[PDB]
Design a protein around this ligand. Structure first.
Ligand SMILES: *[C@@H]1O[C@H](CO)[C@@H](O[C@@H]2O[C@H](CO)[C@@H](O)[C@H](O)[C@H]2NC(C)=O)[C@H](O)[C@H]1NC(C)=O
Lengths: 49, 107, 47, 125, 125, 107
């Protein structure tokens, strides 16, 4: 999420066994970093190997 | 003592030329030169103070610049009445001293 | 008076003091709607 | 603002003389005052400075001990007592006022000069 | 600034030879570079010039077509390829740089030369 | 190809003598001759560039003059080290060319 021009990343890694869809579980995500991009972001691309 | 050395000691140039007179201090005084114009037989006239501020009534062609140890007096375009002896002078600490003098003559 | 290669060279030699080579660093300071990543430190006071 | 100098003339070597600089056109009692001398055909040489109240007095290297600067804020007059005169002291002596042109007052500067008076140290008749 | 030459010697008429001029002590890549020859006992005759970048190339009339100047700005070396050598091409060849006084940048003068190398075109053993 | 001719091709003079060497160009270059001094077996030294201005390190006795097609190399006071072959050289246009050389000899 981008707040006040400050680009914020919240992350959480969990092992799962249901490969089909998202599990019915609760996970709490904690902050990684804050960064100053500050633009009219309208798109984002995932990058896959 | 803070020693101020002017260079050149003298120079010849013609009206309309751009001249540059340098005064270098033995130690950094960091804004404290004062530039004067002296004519033979009369007391000097102040030109530039704090090495970069033009004193009232002096033409805008006169300009000084620099801080620390390297300083310059510049006259953009010479006129006949500007041919004279110019002294730098420090005020950073006592005793106050002068440069040895720079004479501007006609070429 | 045609061309005049602009990249002429200063000749640096101790015989040269208005022409004495001096090494200069220029700082330019600017801030634009971002955290000031440049800061001034403050010392620890004993708690 | 006017600075009237006087006290010049011919003095034999080794005697004494008092120079005067009468101040007018400004509040004298708040400014430092300087003496600046110019040997004949030579460059300017700072001589002596006195604080506004006369409590602080500094002298150049060549005149320590011999020269005494003094002040009279009532008459607004500046004095320079010169003693043990010698051949090298021959110079046109200026009184001068501190002054500072604008707000850069952290410059404390130099300004308006008196007309200057000639002092000749000589045994000639 | 040093200009050390090599590659001279005796060659039978009509064969080819390569002169080399290693430069040091200055920025090689931005200067025009010259060859000048002097046959035994006669005057100085200009030979060839190459631009700093090797694009502009001019030669004397007597060497047009046969003589090729070249440049390697990586090793800071000047070359002159000699072809169809003849008797009149026997000479001492100098490599040299344009150079100027700077203030006067309206001359494109001449300056430091190589020491020179001898090229003798003769079929004698 | 602009041709440069020096006159005389050689001359005999004594130490202290006033020495004059002339160089004539086939067409006007008007300020662009360069004068060189060469001792036998060693590379030439630039003396005058732009036909009137002295190289650094060259004594003041060497003076250049002339403009257009007529130029002069002058040595005010001939010295023992001045006995050598002197070349004029034009840089106005390409290709660059040399005069034939004037040999200053001992009388
Ligand atoms: C951020 O960029 C978008 C376009 O990618 C801007 O959306 C346009 O807004 C104008 C109004 O000023 C509309 O006329 C356009 O039709 C919009 N574009 C599209 C594709 O609909 C948006 O205004 C920008 N944000 C800001 C604050 O200027």
């Amino acid at each position: 999420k981008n707040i006040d021009g400050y680009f914020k990343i919240y992350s959480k890694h969990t092992p799962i066994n249901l490969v089909r869809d998202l599990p019915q579980g609760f996970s709490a995500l904690e902050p990684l970093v804050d960064l100053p991009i500050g633009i009219n972001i309208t798109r984002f691309q995932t990058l896959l190997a | 003592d803070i020693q101020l050395t002017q260079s050149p000691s003298s120079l010849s140039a013609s009206v309309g030329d751009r001249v540059t007179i340098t005064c270098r201090a033995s130690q950094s005084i960091s804004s404290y030169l004062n530039w004067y114009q002296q004519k033979p037989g009369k007391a000097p006239k102040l030109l530039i103070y704090a090495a970069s501020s033009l004193q009232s009534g002096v033409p805008s062609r006169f300009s000084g610049s620099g801080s620390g140890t390297d300083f310059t007096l510049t006259i953009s375009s010479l006129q006949p009445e500007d041919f004279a002896t110019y002294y730098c002078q420090q005020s950073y600490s006592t005793p106050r001293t002068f440069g040895q003098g720079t004479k501007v003559e006609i070429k | 008076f045609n061309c005049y290669f602009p990249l002429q060279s200063y000749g640096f030699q101790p015989t040269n003091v208005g022409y004495q080579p001096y090494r200069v660093v220029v700082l330019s300071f600017e801030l634009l709607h971002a955290p000031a990543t440049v800061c001034g430190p403050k010392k620890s006071t004993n708690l | 603002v006017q600075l009237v100098e006087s006290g010049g003339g011919v003095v034999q070597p080794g005697r004494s003389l008092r120079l005067s600089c009468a101040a007018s056109g400004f509040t004298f009692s708040i400014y430092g005052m300087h003496w600046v001398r110019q040997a004949p055909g030579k460059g300017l040489e700072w001589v002596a400075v006195i604080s506004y109240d006369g409590s602080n007095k500094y002298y150049a290297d060549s005149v320590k001990g011999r020269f005494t600067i003094s002040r009279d804020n009532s008459k607004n007059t500046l004095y320079l007592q010169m003693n043990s005169l010698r051949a090298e002291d021959t110079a046109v002596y200026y009184c001068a006022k501190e002054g500072r042109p604008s707000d850069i007052v952290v410059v404390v500067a130099f300004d308006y000069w008196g007309q200057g008076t000639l002092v000749t140290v000589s045994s000639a008749s």
